[PDB]
Design a protein around this ligand. Sequence first.
Ligand code: GUB
Length: 278
Amino acid sequence: TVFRQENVDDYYDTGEELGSGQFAVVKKCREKSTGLQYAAKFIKKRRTKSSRRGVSREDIEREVSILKEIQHPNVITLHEVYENKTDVILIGELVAGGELFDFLAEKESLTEEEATEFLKQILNGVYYLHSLQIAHFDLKPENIMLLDRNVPKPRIKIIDFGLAHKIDFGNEFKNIFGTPEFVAPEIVNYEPLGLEADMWSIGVITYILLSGASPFLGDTKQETLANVSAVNYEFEDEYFSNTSALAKDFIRRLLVKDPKKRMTIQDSLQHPWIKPQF
Ligand SMILES: OC[C@@H]1O[C@@H](n2cnc3c(NCCc4ccccc4)ncnc32)[C@H](O)[C@@H]1O
């Protein structure tokens, strides 16, 4: 499939840089005809078929196809797609309040209620996606954006569908691999992947929200991945001594090696704590 090949600068002005991937840079922009503001993700194309730099057209088209399906308050919308010889440019919904990651850094101590307020929204967004058989496969605090950081209960949106796949056959097998601290054991072990991997990532995110510490993190990526595969984490009393047993129960039921035994998205919403590479 082909995208709009007019110069994006004919239709938009760009501003500040909002962030980046390998890979990809995201800039604020403004549509000339409406005055509305967006975020534009510039993804570098592969320059040859044999090249390992840039993103393959297959991978770009998959991301665009998935994004076109989605509309839910807790997920980003896609507005337009442009392309030229070097880039595909995905224009989508600006989320102005920064990363949950940055958030957590400033300040860094969340109550269980602040943590569950974030979590409930993440779970609602993932419920929507999983209902559509979409695995995100890159859930982490860098990919959860706040609409407005200056309100007591910030609203969030899930972003970055660069690794997202449709799961039409219960699992997919193609060596998808995100950030070591957040990937499930099946990703580490190059096993077939399904919606369960996202549920593991949610358990990791929850642990971080409550404690400010990363449960599997080692001194090298190697060591992190080995920790993940062995399910080598524990609840440090220094961080968790006054966290409720139910919060710990929730995380325990997500950080499970066997994906078949791990809580599903529907399970997570009914759980008593929630229910009202190289
Ligand atoms: O991805 C690196 C990042 O750069 C920033 N970022 C990425 N997407 C952002 C956005 N909106 C998405 C609009 C979009 C929708 C659909 C396709 C492409 C982009 N709003 C604000 N900051 C964003 C964050 O700091 C991230 O950690």
